[PDB]
A paper describes a structure:
In addition, we solved high-resolution crystal structures of apRAD51C NTD to 1.6 Å and nucleotide-bound apRAD51C CTD to 2.3 Å. Superposition of the apRAD51C CTD with the apCX3 complex show minimal structural changes, so our analysis here focused on the biologically relevant CX3 complex. The NTDI mutations, with [name] R258H located at the beginning of the G264S containing α-helix, point towards a disordered loop in our structure. This disordered loop corresponds to the L2-loop in RAD51 that contributes to and becomes ordered upon DNA binding, implying possible impact of this region to DNA binding. We tested single-stranded DNA (ssDNA) binding of purified apCX3 and apRAD51C proteins. Protein-gel-shift analysis confirmed the ability of apCX3 to bind to ssDNA. Using fluorescence polarization to more rigorously measure DNA binding, the data shows that while wild-type apRAD51C binds ssDNA with an affinity of ~1.25 μM, the [name] R258H mutation dramatically reduces DNA binding affinity ~30 fold (~36.5 μM).
Numbering used by the authors: 74 to 283, 299 to 345
């Protein structure tokens, strides 16, 4: 066996893991969380929490190994604007607090070493943000990612928030529209596999009232029912459609309890 580098061995180990949501209920229906090497899709109407969950995932991928995490970094591709930097602060801060609790309680002198470096700021530093304003910019950026990711093997998650927004307009040539959309999917599948990371795509079209999606291994639909929030597992390897409750808090995505 070999030659492999120790870096190759670390990436194969990560390959196996999932990125927690901070909702025990979301984690259960996802199989432990958002899986690496796969594309996961979050659908729902405006205000359901696509971006909140995206941001929660971008923070969570950075949780250290000694707290059960992936300990990777994130790319966040924003195609819509109206990004609130202060939300990522709130979320990051609560994830730091949560690990500080485990390190102090149930005591390990290497969790105290990680706490040295796991701050709200180090979490914001580990998220690489790009703004795209149209589909052509988005296509050009994705073409550029193999390079970015060679320079940044820390990257374990790529968010595109949202995939649908730059395709919401009429194309004259419809055959071109699907070509381009089937190509992005294949580009995303390729990255997830060759760079051993999760691709997380946000989408408006599929709501709890509603071709593409074939490439997504998991599709979650986030919606409202009465006065609470729910996530439906709409597509998964098990093929069983379970809805679980969740809430959004200043800390981020949490269980209802
Ligand atoms: N600090 C906060 N505490 C609790 N809920 C929040 C907070 N900030 C935003 N929200 C909730 O998050 C929602 C916005 O979710 P967002 O992820 O932007 O939706 P979208 O699916 O359109 O991306 C708002 O409806 C509000 O209900
Ligand atoms: Mg949003």
């Amino acid at each position: 066996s070999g030659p492999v580098t120790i870096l190759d061995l670390l990436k194969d180990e990560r390959s196996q893991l999932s990125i927690v949501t901070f909702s025990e209920q979301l984690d259960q229906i996802l199989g432990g969380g958002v899986p690496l090497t796969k594309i996961t899709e979050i659908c729902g109407a405006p205000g359901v929490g696509k971006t909140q969950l995206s941001m929660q995932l971008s923070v969570d991928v950075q949780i250290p190994k000694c707290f059960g995490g992936v300990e990777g970094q994130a790319i966040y591709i924003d195609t819509e604007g109206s990004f609130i930097v202060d939300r990522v602060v709130d979320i990051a801060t609560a994830t730091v607090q949560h690990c500080q609790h485990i390190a102090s309680i149930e005591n390990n002198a290497e969790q105290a070493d990680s706490m040295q470096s796991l701050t709200m700021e180090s979490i914001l530093e580990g998220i690489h943000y790009f703004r795209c304003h149209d589909y052509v910019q988005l296509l050009a950026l994705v073409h550029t990612l193999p390079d970015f990711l060679k320079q940044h093997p820390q990257i374990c998650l790529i968010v595109v928030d949202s995939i649908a927004f730059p395709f919401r307009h009429h194309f004259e040539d419809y055959a071109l529209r699907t070509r381009l959309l089937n190509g992005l999917a294949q580009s995303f599948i390729k990255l997830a596999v060759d760079f051993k990371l999760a691709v997380l795509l946000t989408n408006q079209m599929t709501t709890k009232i509603s071709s593409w999606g074939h490439s997504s291994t998991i599709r979650l639909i986030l919606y409202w029912q009465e006065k609470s929030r729910y996530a439906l597992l709409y597509k998964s390897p098990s093929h069983k459609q379970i809805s679980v409750p969740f809430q959004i808090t200043t800390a981020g995505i949490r269980d209802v309890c």
